[PDB]
Amino acid sequence: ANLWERFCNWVTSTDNRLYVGWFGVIMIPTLLAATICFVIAFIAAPPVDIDGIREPVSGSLLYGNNIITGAVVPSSNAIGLHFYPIWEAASLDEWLYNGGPYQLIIFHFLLGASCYMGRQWELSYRLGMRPWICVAYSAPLASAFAVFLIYPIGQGSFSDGMPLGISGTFNFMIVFQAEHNILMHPFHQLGVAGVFGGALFCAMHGSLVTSSLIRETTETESANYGYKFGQEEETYNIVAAHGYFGRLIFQYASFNNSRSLHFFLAAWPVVGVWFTALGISTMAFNLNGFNFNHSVIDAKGNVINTWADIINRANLGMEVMHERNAHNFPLDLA
Amino acid sequence: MEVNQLGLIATALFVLVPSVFLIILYVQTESQ
């Protein structure tokens, strides 16, 4: 027909090897920018003054790092929450010093990943599917917004966002424990149950479907060729798996509806992970984990320590050592 | 950086040897 429509039909085409779509129009360039900046910085970025104290932290392979110690380093505390595009710097040299690649990378990524989510909806609509896969992905997405966006906001600086690195991630976890007692927070307890329980049910669902595969092969061939793709029928006896697992425990602790069984597998880790990301997002505003320090005392008033008091000694050692040259006054209020 | 110099040969063979094993087995499947 006309140009705009031939292009609109190419964009929303269900015959492209990779679906594009309108979300895909924003997604592709922003992931490409984030990915290219990240690969170049990880390898070659010079040191970055993360805490605003003129104490640059080296994160790149060419400056003495390996895969496990390297990272793209958060922008400086002197910036705090100010926007810092390249064009705001007097030179790439200044920008590199003050941590600009980190801001470039996380905005293009957060943006491109939010459109990933919409793309999952978009292609399900062109395919005639039910639409809620994207809802599941929102649990990891939301977790990423937490450590890269929400937590910096509440604490007033992208310098306290999660670093883009293996060791940098551990750094962020430890400082989080000292400053918020995340282990004592119920939302993170909900997150562990989230992912332990997910892996559990993952091993269980697989183990129980693999246990009930229908003999379709001989002992010399992979069982896997007993299934052919798009075949009309099922390749395991669910009645048989219910009979096994219903007896492992008792009959009604066992699912016999395929649909109920899979919705359960979707919902458990999604919700848990919603809670732990909700928990990072509310500790962004210093609503922290339970505090039972010196909560038990005797007739006279002596402190009878509990395990919570031992945790606080750990927390305290992280507290006093982190960012060792960055505090001039006795409280660490952000 | 004063790294361990057998690290190179250890990484190299750690990659090469099992990768050659898989390639040997894939190509001789494709030709039958």
Binding site: R17, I43, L61, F229, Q231 | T11
Partner: peptide
């Protein structure tokens, strides 16, 4: 030398992505 090794392995993995997507066994419907 160590940087070169880390980057070479990373580069090979990106190459493997490319082939695994674009040169996959095409799934078909018996």
């Amino acid at each position: 030398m160590e940087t070169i090794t880390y980057v070479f392995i990373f580069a090979c993995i990106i190459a493997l992505f490319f082939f695994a997507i674009f040169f996959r066994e095409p799934p078909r419907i018996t």
